[PDB]
Amino acid sequence: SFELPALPYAKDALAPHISAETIEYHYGKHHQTYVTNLNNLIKGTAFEGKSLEEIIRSSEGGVFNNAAHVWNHTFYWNCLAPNAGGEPTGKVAEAIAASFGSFADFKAQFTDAAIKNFGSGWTWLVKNSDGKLAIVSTSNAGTPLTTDATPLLTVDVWEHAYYIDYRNARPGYLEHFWALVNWEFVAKNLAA
Amino acid sequence: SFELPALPYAKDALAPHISAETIEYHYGKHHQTYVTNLNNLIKGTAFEGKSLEEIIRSSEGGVFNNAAHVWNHTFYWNCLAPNAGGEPTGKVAEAIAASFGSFADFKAQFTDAAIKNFGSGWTWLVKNSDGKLAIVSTSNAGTPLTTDATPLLTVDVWEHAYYIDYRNARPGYLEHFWALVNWEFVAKNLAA
Ligand SMILES: [Fe+3]
């Protein structure tokens, strides 16, 4: 039985970038529901004893949608943090500069892809199997886990992720997303 | 040059089922933006001068997404109305009963499909080339116009259509949607 991992911080820790109200709905209702959905769908199936990643790589339809959504959201919450954001340093900074030229270029490209992601979806910074970094976007519950690329950072662009706080202004949401990036988590993802 | 058609009723005419704030954003900002996006994208091209339908039936990428979105939204605004909703009578009532057995059955199935539509999309009631009615759903900006089916009724299930008024409660949104259905429009679409 899967459970909703506890948020990594206080419900109001991401304010004003992401409100406590958005956390209440996005984490407390949406994410929670995906967990319940998954448990319901895999009950009595061969998926029961499998890890989240394992189910994501061997399922389709509702099972896949909910499994991928549970994983994507948990990853998303860890990509955010209070007293973070800004420009990265250390290994992450070097890696980003090596693949995109500079952080500024990376940022613009990431923001552009996230804003251009049509409909519901996710935009990611990944580390390809060849060690190089790249920006890719997925639709709906899609995830880089079904490929050989390693997710390092993500932004949820389903409208529920920002409508309470930004309405249709996805660009404003992205702007504030940058002020919340947990580069420590990104570094851990990169060094793994 | 395409323009945003005027709303068929006052901004607060659909309340409390759909708020004036939702119209302010959904119609005033979202819809308006697809219109501008479309004009910018086709200026100086062979699409300039064509009708929405013609562009929708001969484009792809951003031109299609916006042309389809403009058409879909104007159609949606016409599917709603104050002092309407309820159960239909006349031609629409007969057609629905003939294809679904009873309005009750139709209503349940249309609602189910709309709630199941994963991600952003639209759920429609259409009349196939054989004259029979059917319920079909499209993703993102997809529309029945790219098929041989004739759209009769539609419900927008992109989260921006209901998040302000219902947050994650799409079922509640659908409940109130029925209270707004403009059967006069549906009848006009059916008899065309
Ligand atoms: Fe989400």
Ligand SMILES: [Fe+3]
């Ligand atoms: Fe819409």
